[PDB]
Amino acid sequence: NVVTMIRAGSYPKVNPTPTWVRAIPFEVSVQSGIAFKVPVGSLFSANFRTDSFTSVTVMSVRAWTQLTPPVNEYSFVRLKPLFKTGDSTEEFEGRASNINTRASVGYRIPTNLRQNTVAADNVCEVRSNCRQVALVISCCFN
Amino acid sequence: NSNVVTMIRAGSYPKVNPTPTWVRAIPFEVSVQSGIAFKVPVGSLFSANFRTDSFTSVTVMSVRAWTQLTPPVNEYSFVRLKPLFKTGDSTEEFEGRASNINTRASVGYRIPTNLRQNTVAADNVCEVRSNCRQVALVISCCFN
Amino acid sequence: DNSNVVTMIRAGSYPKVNPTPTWVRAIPFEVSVQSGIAFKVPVGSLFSANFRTDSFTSVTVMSVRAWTQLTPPVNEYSFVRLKPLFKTGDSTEEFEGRASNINTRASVGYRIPTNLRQNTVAADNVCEVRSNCRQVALVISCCFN
Amino acid sequence: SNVVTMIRAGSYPKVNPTPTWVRAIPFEVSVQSGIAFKVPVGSLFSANFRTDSFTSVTVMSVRAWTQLTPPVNEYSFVRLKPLFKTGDSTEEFEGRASNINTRASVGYRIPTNLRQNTVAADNVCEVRSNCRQVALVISCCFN
Amino acid sequence: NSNVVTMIRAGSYPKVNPTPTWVRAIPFEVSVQSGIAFKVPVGSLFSANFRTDSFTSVTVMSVRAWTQLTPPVNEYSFVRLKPLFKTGDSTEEFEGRASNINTRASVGYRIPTNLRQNTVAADNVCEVRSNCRQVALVISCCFN
Amino acid sequence: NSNVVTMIRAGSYPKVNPTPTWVRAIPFEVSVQSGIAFKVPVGSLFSANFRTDSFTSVTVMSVRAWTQLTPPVNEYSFVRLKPLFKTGDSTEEFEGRASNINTRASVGYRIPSNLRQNTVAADNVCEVRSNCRQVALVISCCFN
Amino acid sequence: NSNVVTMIRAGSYPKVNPTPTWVRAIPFEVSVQSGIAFKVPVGSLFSANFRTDSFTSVTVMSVRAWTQLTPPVNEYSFVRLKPLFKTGDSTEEFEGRASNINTRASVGYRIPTNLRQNTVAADNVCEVRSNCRQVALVISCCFN
RNA sequence: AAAAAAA
RNA sequence: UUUUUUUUUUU
RNA sequence: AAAAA
RNA sequence: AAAAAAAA
RNA sequence: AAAAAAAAA
RNA sequence: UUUUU
RNA sequence: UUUUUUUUU
RNA sequence: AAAAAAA
RNA sequence: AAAAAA
RNA sequence: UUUUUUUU
RNA sequence: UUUUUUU
RNA sequence: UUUUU
RNA sequence: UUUU
């Protein structure tokens, strides 16, 4: 129940600024019928302990409708991946079966497409009948 | 394996945490003077140079030390550690000496589970004594 | 036996849908080659209504294969070379195949490793093609997205 | 392997620049109260589905969900009547909602013997519902 | 095992390639200043001194460094490495310090599969930081 | 697998070699006249077109030959090879004929280990005889 | 597998029946008044909308009821069922309430084998009570 | 459990 | 002496 | 482990 | 078999 | 050697 | 088989 | 088992 | 029933 | 799979 | 796991 | 009797 | 141990 | 669950 001696040897290999696999929850404002390019710079912030990083490797993206849909409609949200080497045209869509329930959808970036992205890049486009969308992006900060 | 994006059938919104915890080993040096103990400040662990400037408390698990500069002429390197705690400072002097004058001296101590509480910047980790002018510290701790 | 009438499906909540999905394909098309000159194969040749792929703007190429489409010059055997090109760096390989019969095509291909399987848009080039035949047929196993 | 490799290709293989592709096409239709709407097959051929290069398709199963809220005091329902060129059906596969804020779903599978092609002028099924829109998901084989 | 030349019943003409690929690790040195990070150019990997002057692109897999000269007086040698990528530079600082003043300081990093693309001579591999004036690098790569 | 860079706990400086060896299959053609033996030079292996302009010697292991052009009228293609050695030329005539006028002829020989020494550019590999005016050679050798 | 018509080696003329028995699950709705028990007529099961207009009798096996419309304000939906038999009505009130105001209420009962006799249009199946103005009934029954 | 049939 | 569909308790 | 159909 | 990077 | 055709008599 | 320790 | 279609050594 | 084999 | 300790 | 190999 | 890539 | 499923 |  007390301190014990450690027989430390040579000075090991160190790294003061290591990588960090994180999950960053943040929201975006969306206009109806209009696509919103989610910026990668939203992941670098003191609010996420990640303002010290300049690049990140996104592994997967997911989205949830943060506000209620227009009256008489069910919530929906689409996600279109974006890459510097070539943007995609897939519209991964998820719709709510209950008007009072969020709509969820996401996608996974293949290993061959997991490169670095800086604050000036864009993750994906977002289309929804709701005015805000909550995202939880699984990415590797480095 | 997959060569293109695939769809994830995500369900309800999960539990999230934008500011989680982080177990780390922080390498930083402190300046030690001959025949004198240096109280290692916990505030040296919160810094943008370790990505931990967003933390205000930390749970230290184990401290290790290495002499960073050469010892005085005709002497071998040594380094001592005295664990400090807010509920009561220790009187142990975990000493490690170098058997070669050109080689570092090293020593460390592990903090028991019953003594692993958070520490703020105004707190201190341990006292350091060495015949060298600088000591390299590697502290394994949990930031929260 | 099999069911001979329409049967009810007990569907549940609305699922996750995607109207514009991906497509792993093997696209055949031809290119014209001159003698002693290398022709850069454009990625835009993969996007056409003749392949049902004019809706795609990007594509991840996995492997390329080539065949000589026309007869070689007199007394010669057909050959063809391929030089992989990437936006991060052009290779210098010249994967060559020669026909052992003057009446037979020459063939060769190259596979792209998973680390170099990024996307390429229409303005990009897949590879360079050299041959003594005035036309080469290309079959490119790729993943449209 | 972190580099390009050589493929020892042989003879020229059989090629097809325009294959068939099996899909699940999502789209919506407008429905009136008391009136049955015929779903055209031509909706399956669109640039929004990457299928504007197709002229025929083999339908296998149809699924329907109510896309808007039902009238006041009611629960959502939806009915599907299959239609064929060899002869229309009289079935009305119906699904109702046990919650007013929740959709209603129903579907039907087309057997193997009735899985022939259909062109844009044809119709898939008749849809009835109390909601003013219905979301359809049709598992079909284009060719 | 045989003592004479023997015939080879060859068949059709094979698939050939006069300019193949090559898996190498290139030993070369760079000059480092105090308190300054030096960017390692990729064009150092292409030279007639390594039989690689015929390539223009290269896929780097892992980098390792060693201090090529002695550290300043009273200091132990150290070396840092910060990986750089055309899609996004890293902020890591993989450091290696020597426990003996007369011994080199070594450290290295590995590039994951999803980041192993080609690099041309204008590109840069990583930054180097060391108290020694020269550093020896061995860059395991794949010339193509 | 992994998705980010990882530290390598490198140790002592390894044994390096900037100019290594290379086992290669070199393809190249030679122009042959009817009824005349052409001595294939070893200097044809050392070329920038083969990334081998940095070598001066090579250890040949096996030689294979293919007729590159069509044979004269009414004849079938044939090709011969006579192995040459600086310690003594051989008199073998390894011949391969085609069973089809449109098809190449092919033959090859393997150099035994006891006769696998180095050859410089001024040396010759073998003599080629053919009714076709060009012959394609694929030589398996070890550059050093 | 078979792609053409095949002959059937039939025999004697079999036993036939142009109007066979049919067992069904009939979905129909009834209007209910608050505080008033509605007697469900069997004549609602005989209709062209169920392909059962040709039948004159039916053996009811089990009944299930759902509230078809929304409940009053500040109330949860409920529905009660009292089985009715020509040999003697019951006094049971199988009741089911909704735990959510937006969710239907549901309850049903099964008729024992000894009580599964035929019923004509002038007969009644059960009484329904609900705070909702319509009830959706699904009756499993054998038409004969 | 209920509808072709089969020696 | 051997099956496709309307509901359907129980292992 | 060597040759010559 | 092959110099290079690794590795109880 | 898929169907149609005598039967293990 | 034929020619070789 | 045989006559024609398709599969597989 | 669609991508690269089917030994 | 990361970061750390064994 | 990159280039050459060994009895259809 | 190898298996790996979106409905 | 947190994260992401 | 730790001072030859």
Ligand SMILES: [Cl-]
């Ligand atoms: Cl709402």
Ligand SMILES: [Cl-]
């Ligand atoms: Cl290159």
Ligand SMILES: [Cl-]
């Ligand atoms: Cl050649």
Ligand SMILES: [Cl-]
């Ligand atoms: Cl013989």
Ligand SMILES: [Cl-]
């Ligand atoms: Cl103890």
Ligand SMILES: [Mg+2]
């Ligand atoms: Mg030819």
Ligand SMILES: [Mg+2]
């Ligand atoms: Mg032949």
